[PDB]
Amino acid sequence: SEESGLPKLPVPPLQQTLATYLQCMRHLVSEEQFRKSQAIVQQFGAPGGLGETLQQKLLERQEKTANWVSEYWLNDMYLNNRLALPVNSSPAVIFARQHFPGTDDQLRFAASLISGVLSYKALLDSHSIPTGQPLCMKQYYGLFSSYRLPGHTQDTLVAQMPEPEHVIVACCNQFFVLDVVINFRRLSEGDLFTQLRKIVKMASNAAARLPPIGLLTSDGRSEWAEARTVLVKDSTNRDSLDMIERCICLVCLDAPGGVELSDTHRALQLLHGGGYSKNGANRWYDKSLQFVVGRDGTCGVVCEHSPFDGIVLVQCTEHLLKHMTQPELVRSPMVPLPAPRRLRWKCSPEIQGHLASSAEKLQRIVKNLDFIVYKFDNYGKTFIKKQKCSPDAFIQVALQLAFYRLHRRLVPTYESASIRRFQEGRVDNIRSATPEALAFVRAVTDHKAAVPASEKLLLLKDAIRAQTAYTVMAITGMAIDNHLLALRELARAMCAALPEMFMDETYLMSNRFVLSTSQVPTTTEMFCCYGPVVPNGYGACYNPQPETILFCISSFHSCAATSSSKFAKAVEESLIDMRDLCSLL
Known part of the structure; x- marks a missing residue:
């Protein structure tokens, strides 16, 4: 059996x-x-x-x-580590520099990348992933169904079926739920483009801008666990966190880089977003895969390591990218099109204090990294x-x-x-x-x-x-x-x-x-x-x-x-x- x-x-x-x-x-x-x-x-x-x-x-x-070491290893290698995930634990993959003359170019790339992600997950869920010696394939099943919960002394790796399936889109530190599958219905690259446009517009609404809660996930694990505890007190925050915890992955529409687009600089943005002043808060680290599609052409994926290793991460990434070079298979319009939902947050004086702390903490990581x-x-x-x-x-x-x-x-x-x-x-x-x-x-x-x-x-x-x-x-x-x-x-x-x-x-x-x-x-x-x-x-x-x-x-x-x-x-x-x-x- x-x-x-x-x-x-x-x-x-x-x-x-x-x-x-x-x-x-x-x-x-x-x-x-x-x-x-x-x-x-x-x-x-x-x-x-x-x-x-x-x-x-x-x-x-x-x-x-x-496996006699699975539990020991998972804890010793990652869950027990108190260091903030950025730089210290989460590796980043940098794709080739892209050229986005306009915002629609950036969005088209994102729509295509998302399409590539879903096609890969379809193969995954259909157990149609190319299995020398037979190897364990469990890691593949942890690509989009994983979430790393913070803890006071030990983190918890949650192993997740939602309907519909959705991804979380980060734009201007604001998070939006983007349903991508609905009754085995799978959004066309075209509908994704339209939805992304709506997101960019709402994200630009001052009267609706919310605190950069994602900044909290970049802090030390015990510090984030403490801040998350404050958050969970409110019913609204619980709902938003839940949506993030159950998404397929994130897609970060990052603002312009400020420096030159060299390989070292693009990597820096993928590693820690360049700090709060840049794209440092347009993230959520507990989630395993965060694909970045910068307005200036800086793209890649930030990976949370606990759920799987380098081999599986690359096979997934290269499949996406290759999928993006292929003729777009014709996918059907959705009628009607619902408007992506912005995740709401119920802020407090405490949370405000946690944001300030995380901002400084993350800044220390930025100025501290010597990368080449x-x-x-x-x-x-x-x-x-x-x-x-x-x-x-x-x-x-x-x-x-x-x-x-x-x-x-x-x-x-x-x-x-x-x-x-x-x-x-x-x-x-x-x-x-x-x-x-x-x-x-x-x-x-x-x-x-x-x-x-x-x-x-x-x-x-x-x-x-x-x-x-x-x-x-x-x-x-x-x-x-x-x-x-x-x-x-x-x-x-x-x-x-x-x-x-x-x-x-x-x-x-x-x-x-x-x-x-x-x-x-x-x-x-x-x-x-x-x-x-x-x-x-x-x-x-x-x-x-x-x-x-x-x-x-x-x-x-x-x-x-x-x-x-x-x-x-x-x-x-x-x-x-x-x-x-x-x-x-």
Whole structure:
């Protein structure tokens, strides 16, 4: 029947994870600290010890659940994070710059994009999405039926059938309900255009302008939860929130950008709207997909990460965009046409105080982000593959060298590995800061050692081999992050006081990803980007093409050590160095 024929996420052998763990951290902590961690781990995983006890409960959990880490992961990775979603968590995809001579051009694009969204959702709901190895498809079903509720300490991801179906249109910080489906009736691209025009007009009505409530969703999670609590007191607000929570997605008709339309600037608008003064309030972050269609041509989609990952987000986005290049299939006029409904809000002195706070908070995020879009154009996948190297592993090694040559040390690095092979599979982590990576970067940067180029090349290839090996380990569910997480939380269930194993500074440091990365390859002229995950870290999202590689680098201005410009430069030098290395003889 209806039971998944997929395999369950595998539980690695306790000793395998512990050995890999120590191997992963040895070169990332002091000798003294390592010696202490060795003893701690030794005691934790000893015969008849706590480790084996937790391992048995995990095995029991594996049997009783579809995926033993789903709950732990969802909370640890997103729902527990208190940071505001903009920049800190919600990635953004930037489409190619568009040209909208008039407002109707902008609206036509929006109408077409909405049409593309509905066609995709139709395939989705009809289970007509193109299913090598079979993969879990749950994420697809969370694209338009998800909503991330804020909480005092832990957020809640709500999994939603309405009639009719609708989308929320944001214009001038005002939100409107736009019914797009009514009795399997699906609005024509033409009716959408007409409806959007009505929206733009009402949105321009001063006597009807309401407070920019969307600004509240850009604040810290606990701060937004508190403000939402004030909101829910009123029956009108409850209704409006409900409509937002049950929409298919948002469509933000953003005002003019103020700066030049470069790749870096357009991305900034998609990341945080440029603050309240710009389009910062013309949003709603709890909702998974917010498609932006700016008047000046800046378009893209802001994604809330909790419900699904990069692969699914891109497949959906590229399907839309491609759909937009296709002949418009003739769709029938609606008679009569109802007028989109503006969502009303019952403001208060409190809410007014929350808006002011959110505005300042969001402003700190804006001025604090150091973002750059660097396009490496010397070579791409073509050259790398000719070196018998995986493009991803090659670039991951380049990032390690770039970080080392700039800051003189390696750091716990994050790189997602998809585990969709297994039921409800999300991801896991690939630890790119390998021992081999260290030997390679050291040989390259230690002038005084005078390591022969021939030797550096050997170290280079061994580092890439190690990268690829860890990658394969992670994707087959044999890595260490999810495993340790489950062991940690199962212990917590036994006693709030965690085992020394997880209180060890080595463990705490191993999960502070100073270098958070991800490869988001696209076939379209679009790119993905996101912020750092720790105050003193970077955000590195790359898109490798046949002859070039796009790099989106983020870091915080607050940290004097990091510099997106310098890191982008170090990446260039690292890729050049590696090219020359592969070109000796």
